[PDB]
Structures are given as structure tokens and as C-alpha cells.
Amino acid sequence: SELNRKLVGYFPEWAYSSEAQGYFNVTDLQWDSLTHIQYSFAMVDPSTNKITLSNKHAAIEEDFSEFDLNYNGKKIELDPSLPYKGHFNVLQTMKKNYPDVSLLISVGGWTGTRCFYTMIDTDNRINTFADSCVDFIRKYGFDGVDIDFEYPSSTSQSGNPDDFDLSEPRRTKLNERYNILIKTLREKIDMASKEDGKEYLLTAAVTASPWVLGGISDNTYAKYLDFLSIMSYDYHGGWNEYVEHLAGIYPNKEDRETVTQIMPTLCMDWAYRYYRGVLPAEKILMGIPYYTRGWENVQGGINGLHGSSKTPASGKYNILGDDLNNDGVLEPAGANPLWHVLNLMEQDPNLKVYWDEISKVPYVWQNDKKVFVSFENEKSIDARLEYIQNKNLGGALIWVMNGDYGLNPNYVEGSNKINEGKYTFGDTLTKRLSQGLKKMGVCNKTPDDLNISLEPINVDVKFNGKYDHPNYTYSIDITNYTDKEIKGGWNVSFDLPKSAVFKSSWGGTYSVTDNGDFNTITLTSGAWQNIAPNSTITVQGMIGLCFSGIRNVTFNGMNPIGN
């Protein structure tokens, strides 16, 4: 059952009362197509270090008397026998008719990560938080916990700048403490599963940014997750000048932001290769956006793409813009749900859609106003399905579910009101994904690393290093725990994810052999590099770009099992 394809959707707690979000509530979720629903979002309490609700009223108090709760044309009433109302009541009520859809509480996000920084400071606070997550999923009928820490990285000035006062003093330890957090959550959740006779889940949404990942050395935490959701979006946007795709699939040598790097990194497939260092494909999910980012007054490019702009798209091209000071004056971002862009194209014949066959995503370009907005449509869904099948991926996650589209019951011909266009939210793309995931069948089980099938040798191989972008300097310690000297000319091999390129060994010689999502690096030492019994020898070299970890380590054609 763990090899089943997954279609994971984030539910926005905030949407049901917001015009720009379409007033999307739980009865608008794509229940027939999703396998998992991630409730966005919970946080960590600053004083108790326990899981806590963001909008408590929305989550457990709202009666929706002023809103339209209906599903399949039938009015949905809150279950009066539950001791809470809100979204959580509607979720549990719907779950009765969709018992195989898993519900998870997502903790964190861009604005909910702040108190993670102080909670991870001590093991007792981590224990308190993990225990509180168990209490919470029991109380509210959740099937698991999703951790969306943005970001547990040493990279200076990553994460929300509002939190620099907490993150910057902690950079050197965040990755280590995050690994303890995830491991502790797994331990507590597994115990609760046994106690309750339920199979509770632990998942995480994780960065796809090479910049953030340069400060994330230990990715062992991934092995404690039921699945790892790659946030393969927000690659490009109004924060800089590069008019490029929000969520490209394949590496694009024409992406101006990375044209000089050793390979194009701002695409799903680069992050896939990165995380293959620690996970099989069937535990990795592709992130899919149902929103846009964009620019206006675009200079150069072709249909805007690969042009430049210092002015993100504004006005009707930015209905999801953040309102920083409640003026109704939204920060330019070119950010829209997909249905709004469809409505804009109904009204403007010169707002046209184009296809990028390299990145395999669409984009929208207004040639008179010079407006470029990223996009997502049936063609990109089909390309994403092909990728998921080709790579044996676990499936996809969607950010956020109210951006999919369908026909609007409140359509008014000629209206420019946000919720009176031809389209509103719907399930067009999500149903198409679900159908394609069904058609391709379950994932294959990725075989174990081949090294475990080899004869053992009592040699310990330890791979460490330091990243100074774009250079990874590795140091490998090889300890001979046998009772005989190992002669020089020994070789060690390891599989290096194709997110990185082996550059040089500083001693001996090396070969590079293609091995799927990896290159097998074989380092052959010189005759003088004898390893005495109970002694350690260290070799170094250089790798370009970063990687989640290395795999399939061998020594002299055998499995190094250390001591």
C-alpha cells in the first residue's frame, strides 16, 4: 500500500472568508481525486512549545452559517455530535464518505516557522512538541503530521526575514537539531500508532533551492518520512529580474539565472536528483503550483520568457498579492490562482498562452502590456504525469488546492469581479492528475544499494565534507579494522547524485561511471597509501554543487561494514 501513487493537496485555512481566494472551504476540496489532504497550517506556541492553531476560529469554531457548505449538490451540515466545529468538523464529516483519504496537519510554512527555532533548542522542548502532535492528531482525527520548517538551513538569511532574530544566531546547529526533531516525531508517532491500532504518518515539505540546500548537510531525516514533498515551485518570481518559469520540470540551459552554473538547478528534476542521495523515487513527491508569479514591463525575451523586469505584475494580474498594511494596496507579485488567469484570457484576446517544450510548462504573455505570468494547464499536467511514471515518483503534492479551476456558478457575462468570471475553483487539473496516476499503476520498489549484496570487509568508510558554493570539498576517512595491513592501490567507490559533478581527486586516480540517477565515483589510491591495522587514512577532493548524501559505498569490491 505504501507503493500506491499519492496525490497530496494543501488545504488553505484562510481561503473561505477571502474574495481573492474564492471563498474556498472544505466542501470545495477535490475529495474524489486526492489521496491526502494537508491542513495548512498549525504553528508552535512561543511559550508552551506545543502545536497550536493559527486561525483557531476557522479551524474549530466557525459554523459556516454565512457560507455555502455543499457537496455533490447536497447541503453539508456540520456533525452536531463532534465537540468542535470549524474546518476540522467539515473534514471529519466528509471523511465518513471518503474514509481512504488521509488527513494530515501541516506545521510551519512561511509564516508559521518562527517558533520552531526556539522549540528545537532543547531535547525536552522537542519531546514536548512531539507529544503535543500526538495529542492533537488523536483529538481532531488526523492521520499524521507534516513538517514544513522553512528552513532548517545554515544558509545565512534564508527563511522568513521576520525571523532572522531567531534563525541567524542558530545557523550552525539548525540542520542537526532538525534531524533530532524529525527522528523524535517518528518515534513518538510510531508508538501512538501501536497504542491506537492506527497507521499514523509523518511527512515533510522540503526546499528545492540549491541556495538553501547548501546549508543542509545531513538529510538522514528523510528516511523517517512516509514521503518527502519537494517544493518544486517558487523557483522564479518578482524578487529578482529573471523572467523565468515558476515551476519548470526539466533543466533549461536558457534559464538566465543559472546560465553560468555547471548545470541548471531551478527545476524539479535537479531537486529529484539531489534527494535521490537519501531516498528512493517512490518516496519522493513532485510539487505542483496552482498559482502564478509574474512581471510587467518585461524587456527583451521571446514572448517575455528569458526577459528582464524590475517590476512584478500588479493590479488585475496580482489578485493574490499580499496586503502588507491593509490598505487594499497589494504588493506586486504577479500572483493569481489559475482560474483567474483563465478569466483574464476570456476578457483579453491578446493575453495568450505559450508552451515551453524544454521546461515543459506553459506561460502567459500579453505582448502589448509586456506582462509575463507563469501558468499550469492540461499540457503541463500531462508532462508531469510522464515524469512521475518515468522516474517512479511517489506522486505529487499541490500548492494550494483552491487554484485549480472549473465552471463558475456565479458567472456574470461582462463582469470584472474576481468571483463572477467564467471560471472559479474546481478540479479540472486535479482530476486529470488523479486519472493519470491511476492509469500508470503502483510504484516499483527500488532495490537496495548493491553494496549490501557484496562480501563484507571490516573497513569503515566515512564520507564528510564542507560546501562553499559551488565547491564541495570532501574528506573520506578509511579505517582498517582487519588484522592485516591493506596494501596501497586499494579503491573505494561511492554513488554521487547527478545533482553534482565530481571534479577532482587530490591523490591517486579516479573514474566516473554512469549509474542511473548517480555517477559511480571510483577512487584508486597509490601504492604508498597502505592502511595499517586499527589505523585511518584520509583522502580528499572536489565536487561541484551539492547532494543530499552518497550511496552504495564499496571498498576493494566488498561491503565496508566497519567494526
Residues that bind Na ion (CB under 5 A): 383, 386
Binding-site partner at residue 110 among Cl ion, Na ion, none, CB < 5 to 8 Å by type: none
Distance of alpha carbon 474 from alpha carbon 505, whole angstroms: 9
Binding-site partner at residue 355 among Cl ion, Na ion, none, CB < 5 to 8 Å by type: Cl ion
* 322 vs 378 by CB, closer to Cl ion: 378
Sequence letter at residue 538: T
Give the residue, chosen from 100, 413, 468, 514, that forms a contact with Cl ion under the rule CB under 5 A: 100
Tell me which residue of 239, 220, 228 sits closest to 178, measured CA to CA: 220
Least distance in angstroms from the C-beta of 416 to Cl ion: 25
* 163 vs 386 by CB, closer to Na ion: 386
Axis-axis angle for helices 378-391, 268-275 (nearest 10): 20
Site for Cl ion contains 95 (CB under 5 A): no
* DSSP per-residue string spanning 244-259: --SS-SS--TT-GGGT
- Burial bucket for residue 257 (CB in 10 Å: 0-12, 13-18, 19+): middle
Distance of alpha carbon 85 from alpha carbon 93, whole angstroms: 10
Radius of gyration of the chain (CA): 25
Give the residue, chosen from 98, 250, 411, 481, that forms a contact with Cl ion under the rule CB under 5 A: 98
Distance of alpha carbon 109 from alpha carbon 102, whole angstroms: 20
* 376 vs 495 by CB, closer to Na ion: 376
* 61 vs 382 by CB, closer to Na ion: 382
Q: Closest-CB residue for Cl ion?
A: 100
* 250 vs 411 by CB, closer to Na ion: 250
* 152 vs 362 by CB, closer to Cl ion: 362
For residues 333 to 362, the per-residue mask of contacts with Cl ion, x marking binding by CB under 5 A and - elsewhere, is ----------------------x------x
* 228 vs 381 by CB, closer to Na ion: 381
Least distance in angstroms from the C-beta of 99 to Cl ion: 5
Return the C-alpha cell found at 536.
585511518
Site for Cl ion contains 170 (CB under 5 A): no
Site for Cl ion contains 468 (CB under 5 A): no
Helix (H) and strand (E) counts for the chain?
11, 28
Binding-site partner at residue 443 among Na ion, Cl ion, none, CB < 5 to 8 Å by type: none
For residue 444, give the 3-state DSSP assignment.
Answer: coil
Interface residues for Cl ion in 357-386 (CB under 5 A)?
Answer: 362, 379
Least distance in angstroms from the C-beta of 380 to Cl ion: 8
Return the C-alpha cell found at 89.
468538523
β-bridge partners, 51: 44
How many residues line the site for Cl ion (CB under 5 A)? 5
* φ, ψ dihedrals at 552, nearest 5°: 60, 45
Least distance in angstroms from the C-beta of 35 to Cl ion: 9
Distance of alpha carbon 503 from alpha carbon 472, whole angstroms: 9
Q: Which residues bind Cl ion (CB under 5 A)?
A: 98, 100, 355, 362, 379
